[PDB]
Symmetry: none
């Protein structure tokens, strides 16, 4: 009766109100704390992302076949039991699938029978007792799976994952405070294009990566390296396009990474950098950099060799002026100089019209120039300049900046 009441209670009109848009401009429905699943939810064909969160006693009716745009279904803490015609429909229609659970209790069985899906995101503790990678032994039949994010506090790499990966393309590893035992088993699996390692507390980058020549995006965030004698061994790999080593504790970055001109992204913010020598910056074509919250006394000169920048950061450190070497660069769009001690502002940095988003709030500048008055490109919603001296700025400068907040 409650399920029948839910259908009449949730009208299509009320549901259309609940539809929002996600990052991909796709229509998402957030079903939050519903005792059942309304058939009116499957009535509305405009849905794309079906977020059903902590919904118990789920029996997904095949009226979902009438829903047209469904490529995402977000199963959070749900014991799902789908019907066979719905199985047939989602085998040809669904394209991504996120699953959150508490061990075997909320892991569903119909997920394996769907063999055409691309994205299979698994959330919840899979490191359960007495079930050491034996539940996921039924993943072998999946040959179309290319994106597989594994965030389940895994202890070891499953051998079944090694068997299945032959047709994989994207893989992400999140351990949230657990030392993974990789044991160099990645030599088998060659097709992999994107690999990520977040907060593994390793300090020792494995060797099986170098046998793979297809990795373009490598994310090693919060790995806390201190002496990277690995970027002399990363010279073996000639596919990595953007290294992501941010929120580490790098004491000094070893110079050899200067030889990879294909590097385009230097994420190194919130670090313990004391001095970083020059030859790091022999690569010219780096766009995004982040160096916030450091102890650097001067930004090294051969960053001046970098001519293809888009973002930097001098946040919360002991740098008082922008060197002429940084003025040899011509592509400073974004920066992060807020809550800092920058004193002198020359005309070279100020004439950079394409300044996209520079943090400057809390900076210890002396006075702000009248060069923030006229042009319709560099303005407040772009550049958040220090508001203590924005008051002493002329009202026409404030006109440009408030124009940013309007235009």
């Amino acid at each position: 009766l409650r399920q029948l009441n839910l259908n009449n209670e949730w009208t299509l009109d009320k549901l259309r109100q609940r539809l929002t848009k996600n990052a991909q401009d796709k229509l998402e429905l957030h079903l939050f704390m519903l005792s059942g699943i309304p058939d009116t939810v499957f009535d509305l064909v405009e849905l794309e992302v079906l977020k059903l969160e902590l919904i118990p006693d789920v029996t997904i009716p095949p009226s979902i076949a009438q829903l047209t745009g469904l490529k995402e279904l977000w199963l959070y803490h749900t014991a799902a039991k789908i019907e066979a015609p719905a199985l047939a429909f989602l085998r040809e229609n669904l394209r991504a699938l996120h699953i959150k659970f508490t061990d075997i209790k909320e892991i569903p069985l119909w997920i394996y029978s769907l063999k055409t899906l691309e994205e299979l995101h698994l959330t919840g503790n899979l490191s359960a007792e007495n079930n050491r990678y034996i539940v996921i032994d039924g993943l072998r039949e999946l040959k179309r799976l290319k994106v597989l994010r594994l965030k389940s506090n895994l202890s070891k790499l499953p051998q079944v994952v090694t068997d299945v990966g032959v047709h994989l393309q994207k893989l992400s590893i999140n351990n949230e405070g657990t030392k993974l035992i990789v044991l160099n088993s990645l030599k088998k699996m060659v097709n992999l294009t994107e690999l990520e390692l977040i907060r593994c507390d390793l300090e020792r980058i494995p060797h099986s990566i170098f046998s793979l020549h297809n990795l373009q995006e490598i994310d090693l965030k919060d790995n806390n390296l201190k002496t990277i004698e690995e970027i002399i061994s990363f010279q073996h790999l000639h596919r990595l396009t953007c290294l992501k080593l941010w929120y580490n504790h790098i004491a000094y970055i070893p110079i050899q990474i200067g030889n990879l001109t294909n590097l385009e992204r230097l994420y190194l913010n919130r670090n313990k950098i004391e001095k970083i020598p020059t030859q790091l910056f022999y690569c010219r074509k780096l766009r995004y950099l982040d160096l916030s919250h450091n102890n650097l006394t001067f930004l090294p000169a051969d960053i001046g060799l970098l001519q293809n920048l888009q973002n930097l950061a001098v946040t919360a450190n002991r740098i008082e002026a922008l060197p002429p070497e940084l003025f040899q660069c011509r592509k400073l769009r974004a920066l992060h100089l807020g809550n800092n001690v920058l004193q002198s502002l020359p005309s070279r940095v100020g004439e950079l019209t394409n300044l996209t988003q520079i943090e400057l709030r809390g900076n210890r500048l002396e006075c702000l120039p009248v060069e923030l008055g006229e042009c319709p490109l560099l303005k407040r919603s772009g550049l958040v300049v220090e508001e203590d001296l924005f008051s002493t700025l002329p009202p026409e400068v404030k006109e440009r900046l408030w124009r940013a907040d309007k235009e």
Copy 2:
């Protein structure tokens, strides 16, 4: 009472607004999980695609004669019982019967009296115990079966299909990861115009494809292939005009790919290709060169030889620069060039008058050339480029471009 209630819930005026249009611009009526098939549906006189999906145990009444435009009878999972005058109506009238199914009772036992059938796709697994293809042993009775699309997961090509093959022309065998062991059974089949071994896990192209002399449209999608060395034997086929090679694992191409001058729509996309030979441009009839999402480091210049080329799509490659003689082609209709690592577009793109959609979202374009506004047929909607990169155009030039957009 059931039919009266059914008609009351879904009256002719109710389904009049429900009248929708399909891809073929024929009127369609998606009847889904409805208790019976209504007579108010039949009161229409121009429905061409009767979409009968999951309607359990219903007798089609004589009122179906009102559907004068009914060419395609889409029977999906529907237990359909029908009377003798309408069986005769089927043997003399119906030209297309598009069947999705799961059971040999869902497929009806009165379509083998049907004779005027000219189009049909079967969708649904057919591998069953003691009841294989005795269902469609009336294919021999079906003397006009030219279109036979099979998303039916057949483990082997039926021999009754071969005996039909005197008039069979299109065989889209989407086996969903099952190999079609042709075993030169298509050697007997000397009259085909098309063959599509889609997702059939070949890894080796059979000789039954080459042995013919009437094939025109060959589509080998997702076969995990490595080498295409066998096209020297393709010179026997004098009518091949298209090879859509979608989603394969090809490491490299040989040079003899240039031999097939008869090729028009040569697809080589979603591959691991690192080198395209100059010999490849020996072909002169190439019309649809879709090289989307590839590993091509640069567009070769000799591609200017293709004077019939209309839709050249090279999105998401690693293409650095565009050579000049690339722009010798003027018949280009859809240049999808996005997600590249291109630094700039040469001014010869302003020479393009047929420029309708050029995808520049990405690349490294400092400023758009003004000549992009010169293209008359190009409107602002067709100019797929980032707004920040787009905004460099002059004010009255933007006024003319917006005038073209609103016209």
